Design an enzyme around this catalytic site. Structure first.
Site, PDB file in Angstrom:
ATOM      1  CE1 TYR B  27      34.286  41.330  42.839  1.00 44.51           C
ATOM      2  CE2 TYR B  27      34.815  39.651  44.490  1.00 44.51           C
ATOM      3  CZ  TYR B  27      34.431  40.946  44.167  1.00 44.51           C
ATOM      4  OH  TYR B  27      34.190  41.838  45.186  1.00 44.51           O
ATOM      5  N   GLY B  29      39.462  34.354  39.062  1.00 42.59           N
ATOM      6  CA  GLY B  29      40.700  33.762  39.494  1.00 42.59           C
ATOM      7  C   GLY B  29      41.319  34.086  40.859  1.00 42.59           C
ATOM      8  N   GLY B  31      40.824  36.761  43.364  1.00 47.05           N
ATOM      9  CA  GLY B  31      40.154  38.003  43.632  1.00 47.05           C
ATOM     10  C   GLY B  31      39.123  37.938  44.678  1.00 47.05           C
ATOM     11  CG  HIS B  47      32.441  29.831  40.785  1.00 42.97           C
ATOM     12  ND1 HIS B  47      33.808  29.686  40.879  1.00 42.97           N
ATOM     13  CD2 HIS B  47      31.925  28.580  40.770  1.00 42.97           C
ATOM     14  CE1 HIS B  47      34.108  28.397  40.921  1.00 42.97           C
ATOM     15  NE2 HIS B  47      32.984  27.707  40.857  1.00 42.97           N
ATOM     16  CG  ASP B  48      35.336  33.904  43.766  1.00 43.67           C
ATOM     17  OD1 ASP B  48      35.563  32.841  43.168  1.00 43.67           O
ATOM     18  OD2 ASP B  48      36.106  34.896  43.741  1.00 43.67           O
ATOM     19  CE1 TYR B  51      33.342  26.092  43.952  1.00 48.40           C
ATOM     20  CE2 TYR B  51      35.479  27.211  43.838  1.00 48.40           C
ATOM     21  CZ  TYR B  51      34.584  26.279  43.334  1.00 48.40           C
ATOM     22  OH  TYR B  51      34.942  25.555  42.214  1.00 48.40           O
ATOM     23  CE1 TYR B  64      32.312  18.622  38.997  1.00 46.18           C
ATOM     24  CE2 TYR B  64      33.352  19.778  40.823  1.00 46.18           C
ATOM     25  CZ  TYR B  64      32.884  19.759  39.525  1.00 46.18           C
ATOM     26  OH  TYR B  64      33.005  20.867  38.734  1.00 46.18           O
ATOM     27  CG  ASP B  89      32.903  23.929  39.859  1.00 42.95           C
ATOM     28  OD1 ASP B  89      33.267  25.036  40.310  1.00 42.95           O
ATOM     29  OD2 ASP B  89      33.473  22.856  40.160  1.00 42.95           O
TER      30      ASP B  89
END
Lengths: 4, 121
Positions: B27, B29, B31, B47-48, B51, B64, B89
Site C-alpha cells: 500500500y 505509494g 497501491g 492512510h490510503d 484519503y 496545507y 498525513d
C-alpha cells in the site's frame, strides 16, 4: 514525485 | 500536498519519503490491494483509507499548513479539506515513526503479484  | 506529507515523513523518520515509503509493501505509494505486509504497510493502508473519506478533496495537490510545538505536529486552520488532509498525513507520519523498528528493506520495490487478498477500510 509522491509519499503514501 | 505531497510536498508536505513528504517533509513531514522526513522530520519524523529521517527517511526520505521518496525511496523509503513510495514503493514499500502493498500500500505504500500506489497501491490498491492485497494484505498489508507489515505495520508500515498497515500504516499506508490506513492512510490510503483516510484519503478515501474525502472524495471531493485533492490530497496529492492541495497544500496545507502545520507547525510543531515541541515536535508535536499541529495542523493549522485552512480549508475543510486541507485540515482533514493534514490530519490524515499527521497520523501516517506518527505511524511510520512508531514502526521504524520493523521497517524491512525486503519490502521496497515489492512485486504486484505478491499482493493477494482482500481488505476493507
Amino acid at each position: 514525485a509522491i509519499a503514501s | 500536498s505531497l510536498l508536505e506529507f513528504g517533509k513531514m515523513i522526513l522530520e519524523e523518520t529521517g527517511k526520505l519519503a521518496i525511496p523509503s515509503y513510495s514503493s514499500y509493501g502493498c500500500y505504500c505509494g500506489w497501491g490498491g490491494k492485497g494484505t498489508p505486509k507489515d505495520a508500515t504497510d498497515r500504516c499506508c493502508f490506513v492512510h490510503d483509507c483516510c484519503y478515501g473519506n474525502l472524495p471531493d478533496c485533492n490530497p496529492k495537490s492541495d497544500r496545507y499548513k502545520y507547525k510543531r510545538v515541541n515536535g508535536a505536529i499541529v495542523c493549522e486552520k485552512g480549508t475543510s479539506c486541507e485540515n482533514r488532509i493534514c490530519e490524515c498525513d499527521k497520523a501516517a507520519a506518527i505511524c511510520f515513526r512508531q514502526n521504524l523498528n520493523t521497517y524491512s528493506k525486503k519490502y521496497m520495490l515489492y512485486p504486484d503479484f505478491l499482493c493477494k487478498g482482500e481488505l476493507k477500510c
